[PDB]
Amino acid sequence: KPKLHITMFPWVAIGHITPFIHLANELAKRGHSISILIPKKAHTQLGHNNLYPDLIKFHIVTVPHVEGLPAGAETASDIDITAKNPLAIAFDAMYEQVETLLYGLKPDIVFYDFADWIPKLAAQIGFKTVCYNVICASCMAIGIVPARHIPKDRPLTEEELMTPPEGYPSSTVVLRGQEARTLSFIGMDYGATKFDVRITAAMQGCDAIGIRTCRELEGPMCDYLSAQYNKPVFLSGPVLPESPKGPLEEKWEKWLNKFEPKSVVYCAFGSQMILQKNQFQELVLGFEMTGLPFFVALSKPHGADSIEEALPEGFLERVGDRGVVHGGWVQQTQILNHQSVGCFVSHCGFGSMWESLLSDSQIVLVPRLADQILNTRLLAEELKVAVEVERGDMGWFSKEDLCKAIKSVMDEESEVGKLVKKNHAKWRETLVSPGYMDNYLEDFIQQLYG
Known part of the structure; x- marks a missing residue:
């Protein structure tokens, strides 16, 4: 079998881009080619993490202008809460650039998370996709799955957030009372659509769900996610970055x-x-x-x-x-x-x-x-x-x-x-x-x- 060419297009946040880069390093270590599409400032901050420069190539995507997004804002850490929706709209507006780059790169597989429209480009250009999640399965499984009904027109109540979705495989890995508000993001507005609509489309559209976890800790959650979306779940393991070297201070x-x-x-x-x-x-x-x-x-x-x-x-x-x-x-x-x-x-x-x-x-x-x-x-x-x-x-x-x-x-x-x-x-x-x-x-x- 020939080596793979994988293109990664993560959500524009350092906390997403960085673990995608860590995984890119692990794949190029095994000989695979990776193209990573990220904004300029993120590349300036993170480019030193590329351990395989012949195999891992960064391609700079420009953040389109949108009403509400300050000039120069490129990632989630560049904005305050008030620009949440403009940043998501600008991200979705990268479609044309990403389409262009994908036509040139001709990848075998594309990794994405919040870019729920990537599966549409998959059909047009001809590649397979993994919706790759840099978080734990339990948060995915207890939140946005078809078994949980999320209204289009109102926020979920604390009591709804407190209730795990039907069939959720744990009575211990659950939220307690007013901890439920920490889960309220699952239904928040997030650009032109609400977050659960984006995540549901991303998960239903991929060829496989990818998760940065292991069977030993979260096997039953992964099985539940596989059943809920009728998709294979691929586990990469935790993909932990190598620790800095040298004597302790x-x-x-x-x-x-x-x-x-x-x-x-x-x-x-x-x-x-x-x-x-x-x-x-x-x-x-x-x-x-x-x-x-x-x-x-x-x-x-x-x-x-x-x-x-x-x-x-x-x-x-x-x-x-x-x-x-x-x-x-x-x-x-x-x-x-x-x-x-x-x-x-x-x-x-x-x-x-x-x-x-x-x-x-x-x-x-x-x-x-x-x-x-x-x-x-x-x-x-x-x-x-x-x-x-x-x-x-x-x-x-x-x-x-x-x-x-x-x-x-x-x-x-x-x-x-x-x-x-x-x-x-x-x-x-x-x-x-x-x-x-x-x-x-x-x-x-x-x-x-x-």
């Missing part, structure tokens, strides 16, 4: 060394979150309360001059040398791999979820977004490899509940800590089996050939 080495193995609690909420000052202070006071060593890597909260200017009064002494709160970039992988770290408090974002699973640290989860919550329910409630921090109806978590969650996995005399550590070790052993990640990628490629 010595100052962190000298610090972590001043502690017993598996004793330090590390915390980070990824590279997008910025907390409000009030929740930031409540968080750090929670870490202080545990009496355990901690290393918190968070962005300074909204409006702060610095991490130190936003800390609550008297914090830094009370704590002394027993905790670090740092607002600059840190080597999360090297920190998690340090023998002194024994717990990882995170928001259960996709990358942090996998890093937690693959580590030997206890897992404590403080989700915010819908996918984060569902990921948290899987780990904490279904697999029981983690604990979840209790929250209020508006997302707020107290220092007492954060402390209790950390204590519950640290305390050596805690049955819940013993259980999740035992379950985590089991699941970690699977997820590092011999050729676990590579086998998903090669299996994914063979599915593309069929």
